[PDB]
Amino acid sequence: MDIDPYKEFGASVELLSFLPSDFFPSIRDLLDTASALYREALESPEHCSPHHTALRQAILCWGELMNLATWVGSNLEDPASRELVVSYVNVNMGLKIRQLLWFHISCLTFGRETVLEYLVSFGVWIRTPPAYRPPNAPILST
Amino acid sequence: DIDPYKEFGASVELLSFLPSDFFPSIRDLLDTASALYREALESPEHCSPHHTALRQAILCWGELMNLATWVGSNLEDPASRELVVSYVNVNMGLKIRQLLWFHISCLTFGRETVLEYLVSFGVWIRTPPAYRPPNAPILST
Amino acid sequence: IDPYKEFGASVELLSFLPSDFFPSIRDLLDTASALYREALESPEHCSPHHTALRQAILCWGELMNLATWVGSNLEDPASRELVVSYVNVNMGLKIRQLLWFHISCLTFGRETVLEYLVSFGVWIRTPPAYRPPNAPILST
Amino acid sequence: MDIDPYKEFGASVELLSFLPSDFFPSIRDLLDTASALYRSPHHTALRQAILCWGELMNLATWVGSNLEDPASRELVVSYVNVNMGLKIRQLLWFHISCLTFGRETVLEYLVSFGVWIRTPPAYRPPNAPILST
Amino acid sequence: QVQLVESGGGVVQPGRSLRLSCAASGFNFNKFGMHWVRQVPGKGLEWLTYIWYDGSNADYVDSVKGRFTISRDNSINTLYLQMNSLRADDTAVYFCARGFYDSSSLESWGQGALVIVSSAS
Amino acid sequence: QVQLVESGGGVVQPGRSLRLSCAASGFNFNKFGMHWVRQVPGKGLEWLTYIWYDGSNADYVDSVKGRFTISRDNSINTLYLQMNSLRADDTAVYFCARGFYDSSSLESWGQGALVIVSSAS
Amino acid sequence: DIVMTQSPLSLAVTPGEPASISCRSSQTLLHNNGYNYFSWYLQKPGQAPQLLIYLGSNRAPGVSDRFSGSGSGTSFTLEISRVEAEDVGVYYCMQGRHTPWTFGQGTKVEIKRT
Amino acid sequence: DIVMTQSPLSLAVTPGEPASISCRSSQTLLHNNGYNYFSWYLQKPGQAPQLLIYLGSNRAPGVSDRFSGSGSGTSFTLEISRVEAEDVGVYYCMQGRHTPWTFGQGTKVEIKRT
């Protein structure tokens, strides 16, 4: 039951749930940035390093899911069933994939210690009187 | 005859000078305690008095929530329920918010800076609004 | 989430103690105050149970303040009673218990408290037909 | 686009796919053994596949609860518990076996199975080759 | 909704004393209070007395102070109002009600019964 | 079991237009489709048209194509079939049904109503 | 002990027009709970009284929205937006700050004759 | 678009004996889900139609086991093991592969006269 993909990496599930859902980016943007900046790195058969097998395993679930969507498109003649299932496959469940991709990506470039402190600082910043906090939100930057 | 903050070098008046708006919501404090300090919260350690205060505040406020639920279930007449729940939630919970913020902040940044932040905030508030600088000092890091 | 965990005890270990065989509130209040006021009043910070008690007394003070406020308002006699009876009887079991624990651990040392607490479980379990007459006291 | 879990582990999808679909085991018992005997990133891959299966089971249960229309249920359940589990079984078996026998003592087993299948049934030796201890 | 029915009303000869019946059902009698309301023709409502759930305390108005008494029997959940030293100014219809909006205003009112005193028949 | 009752049937003078009423209850109208079935005496059943839950799409048969229309009001969960340019070949009893075995065959059929056109009365 | 007061004694309303009635009390009704103990009652010939407004400014359950009221302290007012034919009756205001309870004088409504 | 067909037009059955009726369709009904969209309906004079077989080879809920059918593709058959006195009626087959929906010609049953 205690299946936390972030446990081994030092983070935990509650930390990600600290921030609001809407703050996270979309999907196609993550795919595009990954393809643009790490094509060779993910393609390389070398052992590379942690987080790389993780991204490889993560993208696969999204792929298959979309395969299921395009498969059920033609089938499932009933209109209502069609729309409901397809929306569920691509509007509710993808939240987790988002989170995974964003966490991994942020870890790759700007470090780990950095993404953790950014997460905690951002979590504290949001929950605090609006007039008693710095005017600007914390941009990850480098 | 009890000065809870005396054991850390602060007094009640220091926080009493702090308005109600500054403290965060109760849910925010509970979520912070859960997410950021759960691992060592249950584990046994020496010293670390702040851990002990947080642990007993969580039990106290859980007991208060149980009381709120129990009074909601009974007391058929809705008239009293509003007053009871108001007093239990907004008025009594102020001290819990007061203590939770103090101790959580103390954990993250320690006594070294929180006391100075308190004295500076007091100095800022005491003066009239007319000559008060633009914005309230921020604790920062 | 565990009331006592860090003293080498568990909530299930205290279950064996029946609720009725605890002492009354005012006795624990007096026993703590008279004996250990000086311990309460010091600059030294140690023995976490000191602060823990300081939290227990604060909670009791807040509950008493609520009780008097309810006594002041809520003209309806029936509800006022009911609330007063509940706060007096049902609301104090946990506090009490806490007081019995600490007060009693600063006086007799911890090991003596842990021994008494595991032994007392024997008394309840034995049958009256062959049970020894007397029950064990903390002693010192 | 060029994703395939097998490539980075010195294995090629051809070796893992040369086997027939019937040779693979069920998913209930494979899951049980995986949990029982287990708890390099290979462990992280096993955990990810575990999560994938579990979430698929959550999806199937939820779709069963809702969707009052009866017909769609059978199709959705069959597709996620038959077609969508073949590869899951494949990945779990491939990522589990090697933890016990070892890397090499795996490739050789995979290649021998291709030779065995290619041999006509008439000339095929009776035994059932296995990697053994 | 609770339904309350009174009884015992009618004509009484002058100089005697009479007792009125007001029974209730469908709610927790032990958890709420009761009140008595009077209306002589030509005027409006007038408060008379009330009793708390325990019954230890009671109050009265100066008009009938010391001459009327009220009691309750929680075993059968029935109200009682005893009348003594009746006068010609006491000829009115009597109502028993219950208040539960935080112990202030009456909520459910009974049908009431009229009491008449006179010598002719 | 769901029960559907129609209304509005009867005799109509030639050359005019009439609208039939078919209301349903006891199940989720927004989650299922509706169909119209016709039977002139002497022949069997004939399919006419259908509408999807959203109502954006619709279909028609060549016999009445472009002259009949169907619409639904999800606020009250009521079906509607509008008839214009009625002919002598349209004299038949009309049935509205619902199909849920994976969107293929109708399951519950209403009682139906007959529509008659003629000049005599 | 408390002296109650009502005004105006009579008010005939053409139905469909708004109207307001005022009831005044001598001593303040603001308790330490922030509430005011004041009542609005409705009485019909041959019928038992019915509730109009409870706790000063909260509508009693089941009462139509056509009646509304507000106010605090020693001044209150009952307002009816639209008068219907079934609204004819005599209205009362009551006090429940201190025992003994006291009632008002009454206010009866009717239709202005031609 | 689809041409429907039924045969035989009439069939009188001595009750207690089995019987079979055949309905044929022009275009194949095997969709990519492995299912066939074909129907069996029952119609009674003065009554609304009732379902017989659903999804080609699955019995509709509440229908007695006395009726069974099977088949695939462009050929199907309705079989009744034992004929009861209440089984008299006109039977229909329908198509739901492609819109628009089309019905058959019908098959009425009766008792062979002496």
Author numbering:
A (entry chain C): 1 to 142
B (entry chain B): 2 to 142
C (entry chain A): 3 to 142
D (entry chain D): 1 to 39, 49 to 142
E (entry chain h), F (entry chain H): 1 to 121
G (entry chain l), H (entry chain L): 1 to 114
What's the publication's text?
Hepatitis B virus (HBV) core protein (HBc) plays a crucial role in the virus life cycle, making it an important detection marker for HBV infection and a potential target for treatment. The HBc contains an N-terminal assembly domain for capsid forming (1–149 a.a.) and an arginine-rich C-terminal domain for nucleic binding and nuclear localization (150–183 a.a.). The N-terminal domain has five α helices and forms dimer with four-helix bundles at the interface projecting as spikes through hydrophobic interaction. Typically, 120 dimers with T = 4 icosahedral symmetry could self-assemble into capsids.
